[PDB]
RNA sequence: GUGAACGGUGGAGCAACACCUGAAGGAAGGCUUGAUGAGCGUGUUCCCCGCAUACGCGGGG
């Protein structure tokens, strides 16, 4: 590890006033008129994952020129 | 098939209201714009200094 561990806030949100405009002009074909952030397809989640900065070693049994092509890609 | 792949930190919110920098404090006290310079004497070959190189020029008291 180079850097502390930290963590990445990451949210997944609809968004409510362009899907309010899109079922107002009928773009968007929803029946209901509620949206709901605890669940659904307006779930406004938050979701944590953490985060390092480091330096990866791994070991193997491999052709050097073989994994050097694929890991140049 | 990288325990992956997929995923908006978002929406709203006045820093502002009131509040006298200045009350008092001497630019003063002495001082000719008139002085100085602008007119009155010597009567003929004698000491020093340079250029020369003595044929003489320059200067000096």
Redesign the pocket.
């Known amino acids: 590890r180079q850097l502390p561990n930290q963590m990445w806030?990451?949210?997944?949100?609809?968004?409510i006033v362009?899907a309010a405009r899109h079922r107002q002009s009928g773009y968007l074909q929803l029946r209901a008129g509620k949206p709901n952030?605890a669940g659904g397809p307006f779930k406004?989640?938050?979701?944590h994952r953490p985060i390092v900065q480091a330096e990866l070693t791994a070991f193997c049994v491999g052709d050097q020129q073989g994994i050097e092509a694929l890991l140049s890609e």
């Open positions: 806030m990451q949210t997944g949100r609809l968004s362009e952030p406004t989640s938050i979701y």
